[PDB]
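User: These chains co-purify. Model them together.
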Amino acid sequence: DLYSRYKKLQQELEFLEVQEEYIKDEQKNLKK
Amino acid sequence: RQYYLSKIEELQLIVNDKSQNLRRLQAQRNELNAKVRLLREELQLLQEQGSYVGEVVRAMDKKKVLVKVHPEGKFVVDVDKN
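Assistant: Joint model of the two components:
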């Protein structure tokens, strides 16, 4: 069962990475 | 189990720290977007003209009121939704 939670946290990390990249792009676009 | 527990603890640490980072970044975005929206609506309103200034002489029943304005003169006008 702990495999499941570890993979879920890994997906959480990747999703946060996606959010950070998207926010950087939106920040540049919004500044322009 | 050692591998498993250690890596999930690590994941928790990085995920929470990046969640705080995301909080900061998202807040900055939510201020910038609000400001941009403000400016856009300001310009859209700026397109609207100056609507005159007048003084009413006598209300003459709902949907009709008399008002005098500079040298255009005295006009009867229907009131808006207010």
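Helices of chain A lie at 2-31.
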